[PDB]
Design a protein around this ligand. Sequence first.
Ligand SMILES: NC(=O)C1=CN([C@@H]2O[C@H](COP(=O)(O)OP(=O)(O)OC[C@H]3O[C@@H](n4cnc5c(N)ncnc54)[C@H](OP(=O)(O)O)[C@@H]3O)[C@@H](O)[C@H]2O)C=CC1
Ligand SMILES: [Zn+2]
Lengths: 359, 145, 124, 115, 233, 88
Amino acid sequence: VSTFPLKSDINITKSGKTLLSVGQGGRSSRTGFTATVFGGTGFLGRVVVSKLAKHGTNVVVPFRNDRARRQLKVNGDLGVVNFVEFDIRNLKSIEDSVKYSDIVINLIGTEHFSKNFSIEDVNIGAAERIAKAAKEAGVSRLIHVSSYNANPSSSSDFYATKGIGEQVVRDNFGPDATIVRPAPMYFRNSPFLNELLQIKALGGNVIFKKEVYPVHALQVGEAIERIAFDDATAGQTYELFGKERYSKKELREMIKHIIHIGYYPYSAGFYLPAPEPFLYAFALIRQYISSQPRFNVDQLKRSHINQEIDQSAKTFTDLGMVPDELSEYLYRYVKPHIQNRTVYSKEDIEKLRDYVNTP
Amino acid sequence: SGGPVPVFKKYTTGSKGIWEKIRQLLTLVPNRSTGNPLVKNYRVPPPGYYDRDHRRNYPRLVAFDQTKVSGLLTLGSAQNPRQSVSLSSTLATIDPKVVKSELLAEGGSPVVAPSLNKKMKFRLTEESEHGMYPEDYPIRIFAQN
Amino acid sequence: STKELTTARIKDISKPDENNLQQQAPNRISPWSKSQKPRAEAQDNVRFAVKDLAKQPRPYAAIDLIYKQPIRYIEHDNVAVCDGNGGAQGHPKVYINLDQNKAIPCGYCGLRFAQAAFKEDIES
Amino acid sequence: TNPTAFAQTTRYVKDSTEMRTLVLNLYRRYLRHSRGFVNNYNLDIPASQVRTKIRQEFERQRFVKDLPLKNVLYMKAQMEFQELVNFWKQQCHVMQYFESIKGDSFVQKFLKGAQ
Amino acid sequence: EEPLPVLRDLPRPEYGELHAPVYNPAEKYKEQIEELHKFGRYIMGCLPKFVQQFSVWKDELVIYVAPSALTQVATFLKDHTSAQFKACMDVTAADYPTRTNRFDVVYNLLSVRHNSRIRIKTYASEVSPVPSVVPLFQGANWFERETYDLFGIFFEGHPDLRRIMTDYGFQGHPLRKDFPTTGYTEVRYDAEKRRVVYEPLELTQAWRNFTVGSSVWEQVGDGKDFTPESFKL
Amino acid sequence: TDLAKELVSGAPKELITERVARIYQETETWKIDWDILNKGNRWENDLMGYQSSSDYMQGTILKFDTREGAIRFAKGQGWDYYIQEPKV
Ligand SMILES: NC(=O)C1=CN([C@@H]2O[C@H](COP(=O)(O)OP(=O)(O)OC[C@H]3O[C@@H](n4cnc5c(N)ncnc54)[C@H](OP(=O)(O)O)[C@@H]3O)[C@@H](O)[C@H]2O)C=CC1
Ligand SMILES: [Zn+2]
């Protein structure tokens, strides 16, 4: 960001287009690109879209929810943010969002299968159609986002399909495609944190014993931004994660202690020891009775699997960015949910973390 | 004079038939109209060089400072003749009989601030004249006399 | 055909079509100004992807509706007076000297004139 | 008419020494309200951080010399105190006040466009 | 019980030739200019020490004093029964960068008693303070704050002077001549920060300047004098 | 002249250093305006061809009366400047 994102004013894409950026990088400036951000209306998209538009890149955001795309237009200027109605089952609408696009970003990825899509149909079927269709329109660069633990042979549906999503893209878009693996990001209304703040978290012991490498969502938002303007980063695999290792159960008590939540945790439902069959049965029952995406069977297995760093991939420093730690930002993102306010600074998170580990 | 006026002299929707006599029995003031305009008359047909120059002769901009101010009392006037020349010394040594005609008016009496309009003279009016509130109401009506 | 659509011309070699949405106007293909951006180029933008081209504003080109109009003629005089041909809601009155031997357009309306003698010569 | 909280008369101070003591008390007034500024505006930075930024603000411009321009700098800094203590600036302005902010070689500026 | 008329059908006059008189409007001020000149001379008579000069344009009287002599003259113009200017209507200013004291602080006064207005004009610099007229008129408490906010003029003795027309934390005083008409910054909403943030100015369309094709010739000359002969050498 | 008035005018830091003001004479008075930016003074907007700009001093011109009066102002504000002598 700073004042101007582009490294050089004139950039030539892989397709021979010669794009000249104008202006000093303000709202009324431009960069001559057209970055189609699939799944832009999601949690991750609203950061990817926001950074691209403010610096003058045209953003084509294909949406399926009409009332969620309205707020994305504030970020850009007049004509900067464009909208296309689409569904992954409508091939023609896909080709409307890639015809004029020089950058194509893929963010579509689900954890719960619905009555219209399975986990494979989205992490693969959407990705395969999106990647292959983009190539036929002469898209210069493709960027993809997968799980942080992609594995073709994993028994977890999410990790198995996300891994195959990496293969099927590279057999469709080709060598130019890029794959970026984000660690669980934390931000306002982050799905990673929304499970920790929920008071009635059945199976809290089982769900929160998993391990992670939390990463600030803004940096990943800029991580795609750095990759977008550069052609040197084609055909790579990137895994983005935070230095200091944290576990959900370590966070859950750390989160609760900041909110100061005697008898209350024992009664309101903070700790709900429930049998393993009951958790498996409850998730299956809601899967046919619920109407909103609930806790899934897949996240019962993932809770037993810890995050794995892959050494074949490249870190933040490969892009010149130093990742930020959850300690410097965990307090502010739960500040909404918390005499004299005690602000738990960066260093003081350890002293909180110390208080959790002490029996 | 804006006295009371009947309903049939106001361009408004009226009452036709016995309803007129019903209206004149129930309504507190029978000479008030409903306010709806007359559709048959109101908006019925729709709307479908030097001798004459003064700006160049605008009054000039002349400033009078202490130097020129002193000159009127000593030399006199361009109608009735009689560098840094300070006024304060002139007021210290000059004939008061110059003051009582030049610097002051009507035998040294101070000049009342010039009225922006002399003919602003007021008189207090009464209820039977202006048809406004009676006396107990806490206002009074003034006129130009 | 990617050649006349992006070039300015006096007239059009091909006969235009009202139903071609790539032309500059329904009644003319090539643009009538050197700096005017061809319509085919403009519609190749990001914001025309899902917007229907049929409903976009395509007013008929001005440079044709005038040249359809037959040239006015003047008999036994060499000064042409034109003031909009509509009364007092027109352009300011202008006098056109007819000494030159061709069709001289009006200042504002674009109407062309002639003389009695040169009626046969100018029409050639 | 009744003047508002934390008001002072606008006076053209004609002493070099008196202005020195007026400023010193003023700097303490900011530090006294360090806890409040955090709680009032819900700033993400702790109390010690605000004092650190306030000190960076006061250290920055201590070397001015013109007395006629000393009073002006003391007058407007009083307004900044009065606006902040009375809780007049919106939350966003204070957050961005502390969120503001090494150069690059000529090749780096030549390529992208410089200024 | 009579039918209402129809006004369109009423008979109307017919008017033909028009003789609209064209004479100098300054003639109706012939006495007014005469009355005001004496009054300004009278004030200089009552205040030789402070009234530097004065001038009368039609039916308006101007008094020019130094910043030191401001409150002294305004107190005289308030209390002295010959000139009871009780209400201070306006406290304005303007910028003329050429002179050392660029600003020109104005004081319009109203005399309900004697039915006249006066104009005390005292200069001010970017640093030279001006005494506050609050001890005389409490009605300038808000007219001075506007002048300070839009000019930066330092008013000496104001009970509480601060921003009244600009945004909180605004930088610069706008009505100056060197201050650009578009400002230095403009705001927008940044979703990532989740707040409305200031940002450096950017215009999609810059303010086109059409003053270049201004007049190159003279427009107005000296004019015609109307000074009453009693105020000439 | 010796006064650092830039701390009271509220102008941004860039006016003191990175901008140059010309004191010219168009036929009886002098004017001050700022020289154009290196880049970003005028770029064609890609939507409607509007003449965009990031320079905020493009539309500013100050009408002075005398040369020394203009020079006094430029020194007072701490402005870098140069003077263009008209041809006789
Ligand atoms: N910190 C995080 O959030 C995590 C990041 N990831 C992965 O990163 C990627 C980014 O997703 P994220 O934004 O973070 O979370 P979301 O689940 O909110 O992103 C989902 C986006 O993809 C769209 N989407 C999902 N299914 C479909 C479908 N059948 N058809 C069309 N669109 C669909 C959604 O559309 P819409 O919302 O409009 O209905 C939305 O735009 C995901 O794959 C995620 O699993 C990995 C672990 C956690
Ligand atoms: Zn004509």
